[PDB]
Amino acid sequence: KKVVDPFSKKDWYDVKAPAMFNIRNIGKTLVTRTQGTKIASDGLKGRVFEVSLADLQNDEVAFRKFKLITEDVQGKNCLTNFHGMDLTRDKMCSMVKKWQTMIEAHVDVKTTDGYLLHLFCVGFTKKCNNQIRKTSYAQHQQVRQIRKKMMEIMTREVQTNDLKEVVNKLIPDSIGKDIEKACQSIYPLHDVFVRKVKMLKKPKFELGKLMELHG
Amino acid sequence: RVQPIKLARVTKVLGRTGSQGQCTQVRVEFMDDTSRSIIRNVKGPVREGDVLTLLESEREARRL
Amino acid sequence: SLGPQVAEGENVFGVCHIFASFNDTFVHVTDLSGKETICRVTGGMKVKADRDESSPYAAMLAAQDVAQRCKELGITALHIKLRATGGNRTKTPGPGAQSALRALARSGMKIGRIEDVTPIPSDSTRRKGGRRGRRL
Amino acid sequence: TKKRRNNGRAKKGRGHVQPIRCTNCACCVPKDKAIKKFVIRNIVEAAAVRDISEVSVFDAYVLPKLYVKLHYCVSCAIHSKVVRNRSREARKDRTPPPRFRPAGAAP
RNA sequence: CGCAAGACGGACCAGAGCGAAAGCAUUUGCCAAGAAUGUUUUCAUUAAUCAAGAACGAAAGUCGGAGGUUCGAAGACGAUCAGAUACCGUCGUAGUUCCGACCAUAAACGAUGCCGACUGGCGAUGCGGCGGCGUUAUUCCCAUGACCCGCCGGGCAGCUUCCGGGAAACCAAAGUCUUUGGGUUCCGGGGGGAGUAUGGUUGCAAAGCUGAAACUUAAAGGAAUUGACGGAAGGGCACCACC
RNA sequence: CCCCAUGAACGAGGAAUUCCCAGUAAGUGCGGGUCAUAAGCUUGCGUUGAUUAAGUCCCUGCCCUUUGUACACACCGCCCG
């Protein structure tokens, strides 16, 4: 029986990104008018938006995505925090080519602020120009030592430094380059990225750091 | 979403499709602006220089 | 109706989300969080015949009925996640998925990024119905 | 009388390999046997990009791809002319080919 | 958006690897094991291949639990058909998965015993060793490392060849077979009756091994060649075809 | 055959299906064959004269390669309880 079309009731908030990113005005989102029987901030607070790092930086960051999760609300403002980085589908699919070895290593590590992260890396062998084998695999010995190197760096590079510096780090892709330096002594490698980061455990609350990062 | 009507002039007659062989391929100079040029399928008998009246004006077919 | 804000420049943003399978085509904008909907409509509802559930023309009609209320409630713009049946299912796009995208862009909403989100599985759960294949 | 010296498709040094499921019959065929065709295509397609480029914000952007590696069992890949009977002689040619790389102005 | 269960290890992944074969792709650790190579180490004939005996042995099935996510041998359903107990849709079973026992069979095909020698060209690739006043990657030079080129073993193979083989298809082994003789082991003697009867044996069971006859019958069969013909693929041609 | 009278169905044809590209389709009369008599026929001929593909292999039919075949009295063939 005709009733309550719902937008004509809904309220708007402006999604705000952390400081390390560049521009910070992500877009807008709608919730229901708060009623005592309700907390529009409730239906608002653990929401996560996934935005492209390119929109976030402005660029070459076509591939790469960041998951931004709403951590608190202040009048039409909602302050989000790092929740993850993935790659998309197209980019990842495009690296994976036959005749080359695909190498993956991932490590789970606690940051300086508590956060527990599982953080993945990836690489592919490279034929080097005057090669004339068509393929370019690596040996099992190689990959085992390469993986150890990737893993050592990723734990080394996340142990020291908080969620923010990992972020500050993943933007100019300094890990990538560091891997490249530690591995060329062992075997070629084309590509190379920390390709995903997964938030496993969150520390408790603290608006302090959140605001430090926003505001 | 949409409406307009488009005049287009035959540049080059491609060949014939339809398994029956009754639709003629055509290339069209876009009449109102020459800096356009597209492939359209025809019902009738068509010869160079005469004009189509395109509804769809994107689309651009092929076989069928 | 309504609008997040006057914005003679940037556009209020939502998520487009199209599932194209064969035998239908879902179009779907939601709030960039996802938790809250906004105007759905499928390629089914706008034709009758079951056989024609999934045809691009129906798909157009659906993206048109959708874009309407999209620009009628507040979304000025939308980022799209196209999908297939996925799972062990086919893994290829259904026919009126393209048609829906052409219909909304043409409609005159705004576009932003794209990824595919069909669920591809580090394979298993045996695919349906048996070893000798659908024979037909 | 034995037809292909390769029998089905290349094994030689095994006796076994896991089987895949046809992407059409949902059949079942060893992975050594089975026609495989990669499939990379733009999210948008032919006509769209122009409305897709105009309607979008962003200054260019610049289109994702969907990537899908297909598998067919023999009967499907024949049926649908993925592959086509080749004379007693032509069968021997593993190679591959066409003349331009059909990407817009092909058949 | 989170979470639980059970399943499975995609893309990367190959005429590529290993393993006696059956078979075997997530990480990491432990445990022993296996080949190749290198090797102016050790023994001095230790050795080749095998009745009997024995180890392993995909799948289904069977015994008892765990478990059943997924899919599903049976059944019940909806369609289709002249008939449909089917294919096709749906619901869905034992079962799939896992543990401890059975069972001993698969076009378990490379349909090709195993071991040794000899007879022919080229380029790949896994791997080991060896050589280069060759490339690129670094520091102050390095030790590195990955490559290019060559050489040699032993892998799985490929390619081209009037050696030669074969009925041919084919085959560098199916060669070195009437000019018939390197070692050893196994099975077959027209086709059906038949892996059947019967006794023995193994099995909880389902079944497995060994394995006849009476009678039946003049071809069974192989290979190549050619049409005819196809609801196989590219083909055409004609208003006795369409448009 | 005529003359009168009696003055039917049929008011556009389902499933199907023939034939046809230029003096062609179609309307329209004539002459020849049969013939004693007998044209609704066949068999030409002129007259009046369009619509419409201008091609293609979809269906159909037949020949063209390649391919499969337990067929070869050749698919109208060779089959199970």
Side-chain angles (χ1 to χ4, degrees):
Chain A
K1 54 202 345 309
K2 354 235 61 193
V3 326
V4 213
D5 302 285
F7 306 120
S8 62
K9 293 179 179 179
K10 294 179 179 179
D11 85 350
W12 289 96
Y13 278 131
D14 290 345
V15 176
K16 228 218 224 272
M20 277 188 207
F21 296 97
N22 192 31
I23 330 230
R24 282 169 113 242
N25 192 31
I26 296 169
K28 334 272 202 43
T29 59
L30 36 30
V31 173
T32 60
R33 193 175 188 226
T34 98
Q35 64 180 20
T37 9
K38 255 20 260 159
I39 222 171
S41 64
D42 289 345
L44 177 63
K45 197 287 185 64
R47 291 182 183 174
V48 177
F49 295 97
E50 183 178 2
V51 174
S52 178
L53 177 63
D55 278 351
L56 270 173
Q57 244 4 231
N58 189 77
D59 266 333
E60 104 198 59
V61 302
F63 48 88
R64 236 120 116 228
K65 335 143 84 155
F66 296 97
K67 309 155 126 197
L68 295 174
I69 61 171
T70 299
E71 263 237 81
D72 201 271
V73 175
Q74 293 177 335
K76 343 327 236 143
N77 271 11
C78 294
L79 294 174
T80 60
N81 218 324
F82 177 80
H83 205 267
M85 155 196 110
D86 184 1
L87 312 169
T88 75
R89 281 239 186 115
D90 61 356
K91 179 62 173 171
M92 183 66 75
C93 294
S94 65
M95 302 183 61
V96 175
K97 229 57 165 234
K98 240 157 115 160
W99 291 95
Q100 32 166 65
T101 299
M102 168 170 228
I103 294 169
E104 273 168 311
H106 60 285
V107 172
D108 314 322
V109 63
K110 183 178 179 180
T111 59
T112 59
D113 23 20
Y115 282 118
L116 293 174
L117 295 174
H118 182 197
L119 295 174
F120 310 58
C121 294
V122 63
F124 295 97
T125 60
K126 88 140 205 214
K127 145 175 145 218
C128 55
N129 271 177
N130 45 119
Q131 186 173 355
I132 243 283
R133 124 163 71 239
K134 183 178 179 180
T135 189
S136 67
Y137 267 23
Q139 204 130 358
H140 221 334
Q141 292 177 335
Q142 293 177 335
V143 176
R144 223 218 277 120
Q145 185 64 60
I146 294 169
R147 240 171 316 200
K148 209 125 96 94
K149 283 287 174 69
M150 183 176 282
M151 162 174 94
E152 222 171 60
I153 294 169
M154 269 241 12
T155 58
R156 181 177 65 83
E157 221 53 78
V158 175
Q159 186 173 355
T160 58
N161 290 337
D162 68 7
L163 241 199
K164 202 38 99 276
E165 293 177 350
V166 173
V167 176
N168 290 337
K169 252 178 219 182
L170 295 174
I171 294 169
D173 291 345
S174 295
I175 303 301
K177 218 22 59 166
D178 184 1
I179 292 169
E180 190 129 4
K181 299 296 183 181
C183 299
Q184 185 64 60
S185 65
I186 295 169
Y187 209 95
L189 298 174
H190 122 238
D191 267 284
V192 171
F193 343 77
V194 296
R195 104 205 143 62
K196 177 209 236 243
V197 175
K198 186 200 306 186
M199 294 300 293
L200 297 174
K201 248 253 200 60
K202 294 179 179 179
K204 182 70 114 319
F205 216 166
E206 268 177 277
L207 295 174
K209 238 97 225 205
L210 189 273
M211 336 242 211
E212 293 177 350
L213 188 147
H214 300 291
Chain B
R1 31 27 261 126
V2 144
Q3 35 39 50
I5 294 169
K6 301 212 145 149
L7 295 174
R9 95 183 106 213
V10 176
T11 59
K12 177 188 179 181
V13 63
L14 221 41
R16 305 194 86 132
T17 299
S19 62
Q20 293 177 335
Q22 294 300 320
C23 292
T24 58
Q25 279 178 349
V26 175
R27 185 182 295 276
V28 296
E29 295 302 320
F30 177 80
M31 193 124 146
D32 289 345
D33 184 1
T34 189
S35 178
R36 265 272 202 126
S37 64
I38 274 93
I39 295 169
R40 301 292 237 116
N41 290 337
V42 178
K43 138 195 36 155
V46 175
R47 125 267 201 168
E48 293 177 350
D50 61 356
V51 178
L52 275 66
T53 299
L54 296 174
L55 295 174
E56 306 46 33
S57 67
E58 231 106 79
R59 247 106 100 106
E60 195 243 289
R62 336 191 96 212
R63 124 263 241 107
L64 39 144
Chain C
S1 201
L2 176 143
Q5 165 207 243
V6 84
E8 156 230 302
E10 102 122 28
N11 306 289
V12 173
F13 257 146
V15 296
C16 297
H17 303 291
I18 294 169
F19 188 176
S21 60
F22 306 74
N23 289 337
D24 184 1
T25 60
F26 296 97
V27 173
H28 182 62
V29 175
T30 59
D31 288 345
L32 297 174
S33 63
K35 307 266 221 176
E36 183 178 2
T37 189
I38 61 171
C39 298
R40 186 168 87 234
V41 63
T42 58
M45 175 97 163
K46 299 296 183 181
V47 172
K48 288 304 185 122
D50 251 305
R51 80 213 131 192
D52 290 345
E53 244 179 6
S54 65
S55 65
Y57 116 70
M60 292 300 293
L61 296 174
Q64 300 177 332
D65 289 345
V66 176
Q68 185 64 60
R69 294 182 183 174
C70 294
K71 64 179 180 180
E72 245 180 36
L73 294 174
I75 258 39
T76 59
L78 296 174
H79 284 225
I80 298 169
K81 292 179 179 179
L82 177 63
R83 193 151 148 303
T85 299
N88 236 310
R89 312 283 127 117
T90 173
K91 82 198 315 275
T92 60
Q98 294 300 320
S99 64
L101 245 208
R102 140 104 117 175
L104 62 80
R106 240 255 218 304
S107 61
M109 292 300 293
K110 291 258 348 152
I111 303 301
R113 217 116 239 161
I114 337 248
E115 63 185 342
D116 184 1
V117 296
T118 58
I120 293 169
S122 295
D123 104 319
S124 178
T125 60
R126 135 186 250 119
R127 208 180 162 289
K128 151 188 192 193
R131 164 219 211 58
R132 182 182 65 198
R134 203 175 169 254
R135 56 235 71 132
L136 181 285
Chain D
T1 64
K2 269 163 57 184
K3 182 205 253 193
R4 287 163 279 248
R5 221 214 192 209
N6 186 340
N7 289 337
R9 160 61 144 233
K11 193 151 91 249
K12 295 179 179 179
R14 263 155 258 255
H16 185 62
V17 296
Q18 292 177 335
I20 293 169
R21 298 296 299 278
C22 189
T23 58
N24 192 31
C25 340
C27 55
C28 183
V29 173
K31 183 178 179 180
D32 73 278
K33 200 182 211 204
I35 295 100
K36 289 143 242 200
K37 211 123 230 267
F38 304 96
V39 175
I40 346 261
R41 230 195 265 154
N42 297 62
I43 245 78
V44 296
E45 294 177 350
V49 31
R50 89 146 248 213
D51 288 345
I52 293 169
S53 64
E54 293 177 350
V55 175
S56 66
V57 175
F58 297 97
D59 329 300
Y61 197 47
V62 118
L63 296 174
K65 293 184 175 71
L66 293 174
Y67 302 64
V68 175
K69 161 169 88 349
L70 297 174
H71 298 260
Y72 297 93
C73 69
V74 176
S75 64
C76 282
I78 295 169
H79 179 34
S80 64
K81 340 191 127 180
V82 173
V83 296
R84 118 190 320 146
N85 289 337
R86 321 137 70 194
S87 63
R88 161 202 318 120
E89 295 85 357
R91 310 210 257 241
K92 295 179 179 179
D93 338 334
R94 7 251 317 133
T95 59
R99 298 182 183 174
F100 296 97
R101 295 182 183 174

